[PDB]
Design a protein around this ligand. Sequence first.
Ligand SMILES: C=CCO[C@]1(C=O)C[C@@H](O[C@]2(C(=O)O)C[C@@H](O)[C@@H](O)[C@@H]([C@H](O)CO)O2)[C@@H](O)[C@@H]([C@H](O)CO)O1
Ligand SMILES: [Mg+2]
Ligand SMILES: [Mg+2]
Ligand SMILES: [Zn+2]
Lengths: 216, 217
Amino acid sequence: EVKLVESGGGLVQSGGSLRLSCATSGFTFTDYYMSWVRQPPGKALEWLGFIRNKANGYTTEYSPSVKGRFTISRDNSQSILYLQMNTLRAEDSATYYCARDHDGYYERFSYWGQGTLVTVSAAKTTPPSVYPLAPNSMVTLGCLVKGYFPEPVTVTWNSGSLSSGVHTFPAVLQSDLYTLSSSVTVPSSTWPSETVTCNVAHPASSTKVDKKIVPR
Amino acid sequence: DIVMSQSPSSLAVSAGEKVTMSCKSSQSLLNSRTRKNYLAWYQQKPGQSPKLLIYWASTRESGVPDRFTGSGSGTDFTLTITSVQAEDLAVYYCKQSYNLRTFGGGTKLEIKRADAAPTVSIFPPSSEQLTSGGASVVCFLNNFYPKDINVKWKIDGSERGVLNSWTDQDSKDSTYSMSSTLTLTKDEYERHNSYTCEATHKTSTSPIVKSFNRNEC
Ligand SMILES: C=CCO[C@]1(C=O)C[C@@H](O[C@]2(C(=O)O)C[C@@H](O)[C@@H](O)[C@@H]([C@H](O)CO)O2)[C@@H](O)[C@@H]([C@H](O)CO)O1
Ligand SMILES: [Mg+2]
Ligand SMILES: [Mg+2]
Ligand SMILES: [Zn+2]
């Protein structure tokens, strides 16, 4: 199975530098060009650059938008792709994806990573507060994940075993902090008799929280 | 340079109907040496990475449903979805690879469905929050259509620090959900008894009212 996994995203100040990585497996890495693409929240994809395959000498090309400022490189022993970013500004805040590119035949990006979020800001890292939301044949519970920076957070329920009936509401920025919420709806016959727990992570602050929803 | 433009910006279509969207390049994408059009289509569902659907303008990637068809040549390309399904909700991007690579601006496809009333739930502040000096009250308005909805907060019967957030459309039932959070200080929270969220949606001339009273907690 082909795997592409980006890492290195996070909070950085205006003018600073950051290097992203993209670990790959499941294909002959040196056979392929690799691209970097970014996407500001709610905006279009933007191609940034590629590094060619072995047959083409692993040479690089860049969008005019970032040429001179961003550098792509690759480790052909470990099959890892890199993106070095310099003199970062607010406009560089975006999800960054690596994508498998050309192999000398096909014109396509066959595979994409899950993406890593970069936030360029002067604001400090603030961990979320996580609060339980407790109150038919059906019952709705939730978790309020309040007052964190930067994005993202992840929310699962019962370590992912409850995914059906889950709605996670996109974060909203108010007074320099994000807040999000997540609802889960289960048969009333199963709660509180069975446990329901939201699992929240905030990678920027390495925060890991399990909040059991307890009847009031 | 190569400018990629897409149309429409967005549209909504009912399950089982045909979808048509277009992609224009500022230069022909027809490579004269290989005689193929270097134009691909990607689908990006909410919260996901883009996924390859079509390349060389008309070659459908393995595993991609037959309902997706790419067509066109030179400067104009079309992605057609026959008998659209609830799961096809996504932003669709075209991308040229004739000269480096450039993406179009995307077309957002939403799904039209029958009107559906929200299910509304209200949640009082937790003791773990109140201890800190804050008091957030939350209402979930779940599984409704269309997207437009009004929420009013009433405290002791009069209208009132509100954070509203809508989900992207659901991939299974084509509904929306919204969360509304009213945040007060603990001091202000303790001055009043009744907390009400009122949802008015086109599905009823009667607002859906959910309330709790602080004395009952
Ligand atoms: C324009 C340079 C020379 O053309 C080729 C001959 O086949 C193709 C080159 O591939 C690319 C490139 O690396 O720039 C990528 C590919 O996706 C496509 O955009 C083509 C474009 O259609 C031009 O052919 O360009 C590359 O193999 C190149 C080689 O580096 C030198 O011969 O050769
Ligand atoms: Mg739902
Ligand atoms: Mg009062
Ligand atoms: Zn008051």
